[PDB]
């Protein structure tokens, strides 16, 4: 795994000692080389995980997320120009090296063995995102966005450390196998309830759950495109990855103590799909869509079926690609007009006649068009929750209907019916944004053909 760690380090002084019109080809080319390098990883088989050291290992939950991260970096790096290319050279280098250090702590986090190392690399994942969104937050409340961001994620993720140290000095070391192979059930004393509540509540904060989802929308409407893609895709599915690992312990009380969180997640999934039907600020609709999909994820995690975990990890990867793509299209539209609102930029079936093809393709993946991965995820989660209860399918189908309607409203609101004919500044589509769309929607369809890779440990 150090074969992946150390070139991610050595991509950083590259960016320092390259010059003007020389950083760019180096960073993008070499990051795509690292994408091939981790495409080499996928060997995992049968009995167990694969151990890349006495320190690192990979579960098959971790392999598609790690490949998704090293796929998403060069896409992101090309995406984050034309809004900072006119800024200074040293600040641009600092931005690129910030993203590289960010990816490095993401690889650190996904290839964890011990949960304490996982926690250190969790908040090391946190700290570059803060600096990016605050330095290039590009709107008047990036102050409040970063402040809400860091205080929610730390103050939720703070007692998780205490609970993990307590588990450390009551059950030996914290390798995932020695967390396994030795775990004993823990009864319904209230200390067990608070310990489970601490761990599960910290990752509830990081998903988000419904009672703590206003962490999200300021932190995406007042962020640059790179930090937004990082935050949405890699950080929310990293929180899901963490709960998927640490839910191995404390199974004999999660049945008794999991009842309020499921109901909060279900009714809040309905309320969040309702709240993103009527808002302006088009950038935020993807954020509330993300809250809806993560509520479905949390339903899938707290029910404990292998069907549920397969559907959960498929929903994770497909929604990560969908949200990162659709953030990039919203950034394209904001590069067109300086509005960020929804009802202003209209028309665009005439003009840019193939940008609409990418909007349609993203909107139908967010619809969960049926050969795609998102319908695979949502379908197996609905199957597992109907085996959980014979009644919850009302909420799932009503989520499906309202999700169809707001995704279609996003499609046919801003890009259907009449141009406002006082715009007269939008350029025809560059090769760059079309290349970014092509980097998004080739792997999603190629996994739609052969999806046996991305299913979880319970394959």
């Amino acid at each position: 795994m150090l074969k992946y760690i150390i070139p991610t380090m050595m991509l950083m002084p590259l960016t320092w000692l390259s010059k003007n019109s020389m950083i760019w080809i180096n960073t993008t080319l070499h990051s795509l080389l690292i994408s091939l390098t981790s495409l080499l990883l996928l060997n995992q088989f049968g009995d167990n995980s694969l151990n890349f050291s006495l320190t690192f290992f990979s579960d098959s939950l971790s392999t598609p997320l790690l490949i998704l991260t090293m796929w998403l970096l060069p896409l992101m790096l090309m995406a984050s120009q034309h809004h900072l290319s006119k800024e200074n050279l040293a600040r641009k280098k600092l931005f690129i090296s910030m993203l590289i250090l960010l990816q490095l702590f993401l690889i650190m986090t996904f290839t964890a063995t011990e949960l304490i190392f996982f926690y250190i690399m969790f908040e090391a994942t946190l700290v570059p995102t803060l600096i990016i969104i605050t330095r290039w937050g590009n709107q008047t409340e990036r102050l409040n966005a970063g402040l809400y961001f860091l205080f929610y994620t730390l103050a939720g993720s703070l007692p998780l450390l205490v609970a993990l140290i307590y588990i450390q000095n009551t059950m030996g070391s914290l390798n995932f196998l020695i967390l396994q192979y030795w775990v004993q059930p823990m009864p319904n004393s209230w200390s067990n309830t608070f310990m489970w509540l601490a761990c599960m509540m910290a990752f509830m904060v990081k998903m988000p759950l419904y009672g703590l989802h206003l962490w999200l929308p300021k932190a995406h409407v007042e962020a640059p495109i790179a930090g937004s893609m990082v935050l949405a895709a890699i950080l929310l599915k990293l929180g899901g990855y963490g709960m998927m690992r640490i839910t191995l312990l404390l199974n004999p009380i999660t049945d008794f103590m999991a009842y309020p969180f499921i109901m909060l997640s279900l009714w809040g999934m309905i309320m969040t799909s309702s709240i993103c039907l009527r808002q302006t600020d088009l950038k935020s609709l993807i954020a509330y869509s993300s809250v809806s999909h993560m509520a479905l994820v949390i339903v899938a995690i707290l029910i404990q079926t292998p069907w549920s975990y397969m559907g959960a990890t498929a929903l994770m990867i497909a929604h990560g690609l969908t949200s990162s793509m659709l953030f990039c299209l919203a950034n394209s539209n904001y590069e067109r007009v300086h509005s960020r609102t929804m009802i202003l930029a209209r028309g665009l079936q005439t003009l840019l006649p193939l940008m609409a093809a990418w909007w349609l393709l993203a909107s139908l993946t967010n619809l969960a068009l049926p050969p795609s991965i998102n319908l695979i995820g949502e379908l197996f989660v609905v199957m597992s929750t109907f085996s959980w209860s014979n009644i919850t399918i009302i909420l799932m189908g009503l989520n499906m209907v309202i999700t169809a309607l707001y995704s279609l409203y996003m499609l046919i609101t801003t890009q259907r019916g009449k141009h406002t004919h006082h715009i007269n500044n939008i350029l025809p589509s560059f090769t760059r944004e079309n290349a970014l769309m092509s980097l998004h929607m080739l792997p999603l369809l190629l996994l739609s053909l052969n999806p046996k890779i991305i299913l979880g440990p319970l394959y």
Binding site: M271, S274, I275, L277, R278
Partner: protein
């Protein structure tokens, strides 16, 4: 039904694009002998509706209603099929009368043309389809059920009875439309014409409720 209404929609679109995409039955009145390929096409289609005995439209509709009559039915659905066959007869005859054999009410500078190879090929092909394919398909099916075939009297005649009384009923409505009185809406007229009340009520109440709850309760 597939052969049937594909041919019917295609004839309708032929008429509509023949008359400058105006599409409405008022301001369309008399178009018989404005070339009668399309008028022949529509009278073939709309008399294949209810099954002029016995064509392709006869077999499906009338064996369905007589087998429903020879079944442990729900005693109200039989009367529903009765009234529905009468209704489909009367609007079929009314749409033929108002479309073709009325008096010509359509704006001037006529540009009617159907000397057109693709349209005569398509309409030819589907009238030849909808005249033979019902008998051809219905003949060589493997018998997947036991046909009844043993009906009482005044229960096999009733199909043709309802279609003929529908023709006569729409005919007398037509010959009252020839009169001049300027009658008034009696609210069953309004219930029939204005979709009665379901799309208006649902499409003006169900959007307003969920978005009243979206603004006050949910968002703000």
């Amino acid at each position: 039904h597939a052969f049937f209404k594909a041919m019917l929609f295609m004839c309708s679109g032929s008429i509509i694009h023949s008359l400058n995409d105006e599409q409405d039955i008022r301001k369309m009145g008399g178009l018989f002998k404005a070339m009668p390929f399309t008028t022949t096409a529509l009278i073939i289609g709309s008399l294949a509706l209810t099954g002029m005995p016995f064509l392709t439209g006869f077999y499906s509709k009338d064996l369905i209603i007589e087998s429903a009559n020879t079944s442990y039915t729900n005693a109200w659905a039989l009367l529903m099929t009765l009234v529905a066959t009468s209704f489909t007869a009367i609007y079929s005859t009314r749409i033929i009368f108002f479309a073709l054999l009325g008096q010509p009410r359509f704006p001037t500078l006529i540009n009617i043309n159907e000397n057109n190879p693709f349209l005569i090929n398509s309409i030819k092909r589907l009238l030849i389809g909808s005249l033979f394919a019902g008998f051809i398909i219905s003949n060589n099916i493997p018998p997947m059920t036991i046909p009844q075939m043993t009906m009482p009297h005044y229960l096999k005649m009733t199909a043709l009875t309802v279609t003929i009384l529908g023709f006569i009923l729409a005919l007398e409505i037509s010959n009252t439309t020839h009169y001049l009185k300027f009658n008034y809406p009696s609210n069953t007229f309004k219930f029939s014409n204005l979709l009665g009340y379901y799309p208006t009520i649902m499409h003006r109440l169900t959007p307003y409720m969920n978005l009243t709850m979206s603004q006050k309760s949910a968002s703000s």
